[PDB]
Amino acid sequence: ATVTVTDDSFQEDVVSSNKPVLVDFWATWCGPCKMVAPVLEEIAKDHGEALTIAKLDVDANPETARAFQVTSIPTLILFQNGEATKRIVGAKSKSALLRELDGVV
């Protein structure tokens, strides 16, 4: 359910997205990134009609990491109509992320 976005695809996949997109800016070795990943997938499976969930590997896509000044990981950014509207830092439980996504799901 989760989609992979890159520096090349970001504009089409996220900024030009008809529906809201939550982007997980993550890195490979980071504990909280490993933990939040399946939580996001379970959210994407449950709320797929309302919300797209995307992953952006910061090490592989440094242009987009830098554009949103990602300096803590994971950083989750909600995009609505081309604009970043929520920024959530750290692993979060399913319930905590659903709090942050209230009115979007």
CB nearer to its own copies: give 51 or 65: 65
Q: How many Å apart are CA 25 and CA 65, to the nearest integer?
A: 7
> With CB cut-offs between 5 and 8 Å by kind, which of Na ion, its own copies, none does residue 32 bind?
its own copies
- Taking alpha carbons only, the member of 59, 1, 71, 69 closest to residue 29 is 59
Name the active-site residue from 5, 22, 33, 36.
33
Residue 59, interface with Na ion (CB under 5 A)? yes
Q: How many Å apart are CA 25 and CA 87, to the nearest integer?
A: 11
33 is catalytic: yes
Name the active-site residue from 30, 44, 84, 104.
30
